[PDB]
């Protein structure tokens, strides 16, 4: 790994290397310029129980929008973002050699994800280890776990970092400050993660 921009981890469904995809769907179409995903992922990405991972957001009843959208756009990020090289790490297992880690989430992005899954229920603080995927798909281990959201991810940062295993580490940088990576961005006025992978190869550049 002497190159870590303009790259793609190497993950169950992602492509190759990074190129255009105008055929993206509505969240994940910020990434059509230049992506890492395909039109299927994409769209799969949109989708309860997706062909992806059969992943259920509706393991303690029905998941608000206003949060699954958060789970989504994190979605099209992990499985479209071509600047995520300076976070790559060899893992080795039976979905997925590659992935990322300790990615530096904006602020922002963290304490607005947070919020807007208040009023959502969970089971439990790690969503990649410990369901039960009997059914086709995970279910609550222990069926009378379900609580507030809040309640298994007290602060932003607990359930930013934790919640996919330590994918991501918040920073205290906010949004604009090209320090830290956004999972929402308009790109009508450019995707910012481009200048924040450069500035973090450089960091850790040489020696
Ligand atoms: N930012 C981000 N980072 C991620 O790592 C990430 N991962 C997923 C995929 N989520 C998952 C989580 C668990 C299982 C799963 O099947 N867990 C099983 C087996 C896990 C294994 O064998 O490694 C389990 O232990 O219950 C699948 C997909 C989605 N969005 C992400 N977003
Ligand atoms: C994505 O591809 C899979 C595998 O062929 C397919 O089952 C799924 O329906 C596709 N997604 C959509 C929305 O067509
Ligand atoms: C998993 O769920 C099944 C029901 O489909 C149940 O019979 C089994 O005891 C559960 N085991 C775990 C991991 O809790
Ligand atoms: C947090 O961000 C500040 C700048 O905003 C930086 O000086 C510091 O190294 C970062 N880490 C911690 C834990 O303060």
């Known amino acids: 790994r002497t190159e870590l921009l303009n790259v793609c981890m190497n993950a169950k469904h992602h492509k190759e290397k990074p190129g255009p995809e105008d055929k993206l769907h509505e969240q ?21 129980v997706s062909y992806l ?9 029905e998941m608000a929008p206003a949060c699954k959208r958060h789970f ?9 973002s071509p600047n995520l090289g300076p976070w790559i790490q060899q893992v080795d297992q039976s979905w997925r050699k590659e ?3 300790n990615v530096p989430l904006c602020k922002e992005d963290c304490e607005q994800w947070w919020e807007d899954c208040r ?13 039960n995927w009997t059914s086709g798909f995970n279910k609550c281990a222990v069926g009378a776990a379900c609580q507030p959201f809040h309640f ?3 602060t932003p940062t607990v359930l930013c970092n934790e919640i996919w295993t330590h994918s991501y580490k918040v920073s205290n940088y906010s ?19 481009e200048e924040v992978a450069r500035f973090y190869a450089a960091a850790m550049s040489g020696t």
């Open 28 to 48: 994940c179409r910020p990434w059509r310029k230049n992506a890492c995903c395909s039109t299927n992922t994409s769209q799969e990405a949109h989708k309860d």
């Open 72 to 80: 989504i756009q994190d979605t099209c990020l992990y499985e479209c």
């Open 152 to 154: 298994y991810f007290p």
């Open 53 to 61: 991972y059969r992943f259920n957001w509706n393991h303690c009843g």
């Open 119 to 131: 009023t959502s229920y969970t089971c439990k603080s790690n969503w990649h280890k410990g369901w």
């Open 99 to 101: 992935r990322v880690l």
């Open 175 to 193: 949004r604009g400050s090209g320090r830290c990576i956004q999972m929402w961005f308009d790109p009508a006025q450019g995707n910012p993660n």
